[PDB]
Amino acid sequence: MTMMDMNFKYCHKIMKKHSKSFSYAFDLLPEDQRKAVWAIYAVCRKIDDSIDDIQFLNQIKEDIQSIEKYPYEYHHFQSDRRIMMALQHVAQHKNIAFQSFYNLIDTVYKDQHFTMFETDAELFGYCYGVAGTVGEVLTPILSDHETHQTYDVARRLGESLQLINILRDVGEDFENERIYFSKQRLKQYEVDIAEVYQNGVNNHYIDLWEYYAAIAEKDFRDVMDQIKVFSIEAQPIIELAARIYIEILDEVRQANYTLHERVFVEKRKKAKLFHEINSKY
Ligand SMILES: [Mg+2]
Numbered sequence: 001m002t003m004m005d006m007n008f009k010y011c012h013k014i015m016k017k018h019s020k021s022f023s024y025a026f027d028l029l030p031e032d033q034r035k036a037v038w039a040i041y042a043v044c045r046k047i048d049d050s051i052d053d054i055q056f057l058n059q060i061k062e063d064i065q066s067i068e069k070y071p072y073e074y075h076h077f078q079s080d081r082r083i084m085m086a087l088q089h090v091a092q093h094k095n096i097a098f099q100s101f102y103n104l105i106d107t108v109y110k111d112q113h114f115t116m117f118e119t120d121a122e123l124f125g126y127c128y129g130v131a132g133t134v135g136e137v138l139t140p141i142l143s144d145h146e147t148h149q150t151y152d153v154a155r156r157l158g159e160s161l162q163l164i165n166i167l168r169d170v171g172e173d174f175e176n177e178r179i180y181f182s183k184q185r186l187k188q189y190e191v192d193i194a195e196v197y198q199n200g201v202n203n204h205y206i207d208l209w210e211y212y213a214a215i216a217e218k219d220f221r222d223v224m225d226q227i228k229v230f231s232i233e234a235q236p237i238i239e240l241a242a243r244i245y246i247e248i249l250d251e252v253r254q255a256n257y258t259l260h261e262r263v264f265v266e267k268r269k270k271a272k273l274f275h276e277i278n279s280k281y
Pocket of ligand 1: 165
């Protein structure tokens, strides 16, 4: 393989190491598209993990800015060369929504001074920042002609995926001093996450969790209803990614909403969903 192949293989490794679900689905795309997805996804992961000082994050941002301003010049990247070389390669063939990467970077910087969200509006604003943006950047790769609708559908799906992630990770996030449910909603439902972490679930908690799960599910249905905005080859792949991730909600229920382990959809179940979907197509 070539040097560029090596850069993309590394991006693949990062994506698969982070999400078995998204790698399972997206690796089914045609070669050129899945490679572009590995590259964009790896860039988002590097941004999301950068703090663990803002030093490296600042480098990533300057690297992306160099690509945006001079896509066909050679750059001595400051952050992760393999990933930026791959992103630049993609940038030379596809329209990348650079502002969406900057919105993501801005959100991650803010996360440094994290304080609970006062309202669901702030929570959903956070979902846009860390995941709606990912949906936006992948949009040109997964569609033939991008319209505001294409971005809207991709943005909403990313945000729904983030909300499902939050619903899966209540426990581990709490251990890491983060609570994503809003203070407004916690007060309304009379839920104290630390109390639930210590004592186990109860009906108030389950009702609150289900309140958010219903939002994720409805947004998922709306996205499925508009799947035709994506290219014919990406449609079943996106449906699979979404279904695989959404199944996480049932896995949490089956584990009695436990705050003490990370539930998951086993590979065999992922293959079952692919079968059902791929049968529709
Ligand atoms: Mg999480």
